[PDB]
Design a binder for this molecule. Structure first.
Ligand SMILES: [Mn+2]
Ligand SMILES: [Mn+2]
Ligand code: NA
Ligand code: NA
Ligand SMILES: [Zn+2]
Ligand SMILES: [Zn+2]
Lengths: 309, 309
């Protein structure tokens, strides 16, 4: 079995977002919206249910670990079910949780050279945390080939660089490089079962599509329903294209893309607080369901048992 | 009225702590301990109930704001009840929450030159956050005199430097300076009512004691019951003295100190997960109660109406 646990399913800011009173956030607080609160984007993976690899360490990590019992196996006075961390980018919503793991260093952290550069300069987590019992031990994710983390020896990870959209603090946001952003294929090598995980997806091409057809489950960017959602909700002016996100709806959107993948389990994750698919009663949620696409929620468990071929 | 809201009452790591299986943390998880979960040290202050000053921005800030309704007055599509932030030190447990307020910049942040130096070098929040709509606007806390934040014009803040115990990442942890750590007197200038707040207190002297006698409520470091608590619980080797904390019990401890203050309301805050006072049934909790000392909990409201003289 490959076990996938969704710790957090929201985009940056979570749901509801602390400073937002958009129709969803305010509707949630007022008790009029049928929706469930979500913490920030993060999943955990395991090949045995005991040793876990954390993919992205969100600012909500304390609440996320608390909610998932295998995160505390209680085998010793100090213990954790996290055996390694993999980072897919250097965004604040995917890295700030490392600060909350300071009491448990050293930790093995896998990330690209690009991300390690951000996390030793602009957001210098590797430098800061080194003062807590050795801190973060960097394992380089190369831009080709695959890697296996010893704690989960049956999971083989193959990174795929995606279009670079480095965070605003990055000494190179204006000068994007391959390795700023990854999607990950993860294979259980006992069964061939494969997960493709890309919480940020701003572009697809034929190479990416072909590689995705090899997957059994696609767990992909669900940030916005429409490219101009933030303007429609009155909560800003950024578009999906500016932020590196393919919206669900419209030409070139992810629902059009996912139409090419009938055999795969398809799950949207990293959903912004503005996205109507969070409202369980919306026509947008009904449309995703009609298309065989699921909307990730906190605490969702995905089990991959086998490969489709 | 001066309104004091306890957002978080635990020391670093919170309660239970994510990687800890000490008698308290494991007893809480097992359901055998009568105790309440706590997020990391933070309070909010107001003179009117509408405009709030956040003192320390903890890693748990999202959950803390969510739990306290005046933090979201819903006056516009983007809004917050936080009108300014005051930092008493540059520790990770008092500053990491600023990253979670990125969507609402600019913010007015008050801190000493010492703390601003840490937060522009070793943990460069001021630099990072400047890329989110202007980021954090520094207002210098001088080491003498007082300051008033315009949003709460009836609250007068008077800092008192405490013994310096800079965080492990600080380019000057080995070279301590006045201004690394503050306690704060806050006066409602309509009534003379005064709060003294010192979540980290590693030393008292006559000057500090005299100034404390002017307060109506003392809200002070409750980290450890005994100086060697972490060793007693088997979860490490650090002592209170090494960490800059006066333990409750023993000579020179805070209960002995607080005995000198019979007229004041006395509340312990920043309580470590190991501290037996978290167990509502412990002899230690019974002793604090016998002494007229309260144990802060998340969501505790303290109202100061008047001054004792
Ligand atoms: Mn994001
Ligand atoms: Mn602390
Ligand atoms: Na967002
Ligand atoms: Na602690
Ligand atoms: Zn919203
Ligand atoms: Zn504990």
């Amino acid at each position: 079995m490959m076990y996938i646990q969704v710790l957090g399913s929201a985009a940056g800011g979570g749901f509801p977002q602390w400073n937002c009173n958009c129709v969803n956030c305010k509707g949630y607080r007022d008790g009029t919206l049928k929706a469930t609160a979500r913490t920030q984007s993060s999943i955990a993976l395991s090949d045995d249910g005991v040793h876990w690899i954390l993919c992205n360490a969100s600012p909500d990590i304390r609440a996320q670990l608390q909610a998932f019992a295998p995160m505390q196996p209680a085998r010793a006075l100090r213990d954790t079910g996290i055996n390694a961390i993999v980072l897919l980018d250097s965004q604040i919503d995917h890295t700030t949780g490392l600060l909350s793991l300071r009491e448990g260093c050293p930790h093995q952290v896998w990330c690209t050279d690009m991300v390690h550069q951000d996390l030793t300069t602009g957001f210098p987590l590797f430098n800061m945390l080194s003062h807590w019992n050795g801190g973060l031990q960097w394992n380089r994710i190369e831009l080709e080939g695959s890697f296996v983390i010893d704690a989960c020896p049956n999971l083989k990870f193959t990174p795929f660089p995606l279009r670079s959209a480095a965070p605003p603090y990055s000494p190179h946001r204006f000068d994007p490089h391959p390795g700023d952003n990854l999607g990950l294929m993860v294979e259980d090598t006992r069964t061939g079962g494969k997960l493709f995980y890309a919480p940020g997806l701003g572009q697809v091409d034929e190479k990416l599509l072909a590689m995705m057809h090899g997957a059994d489950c696609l767990l992909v960017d669900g940030t916005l329903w429409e490219d101009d959602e933030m303007q429609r909700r009155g909560v800003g002016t950024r578009t999906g294209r500016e932020m590196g996100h393919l919206a669900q709806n419209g030409p070139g959107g992810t629902l059009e893309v996912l139409d090419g993948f009938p055999r795969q389990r398809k799950v949207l994750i990293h959903i912004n607080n503005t996205n109507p698919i969070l409202d369980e009663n919306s026509p947008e949620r009904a449309e995703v369901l009609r298309r065989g696409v699921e909307v990730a929620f906190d605490g969702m468990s995905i089990e991959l048992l086998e490969h489709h071929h």
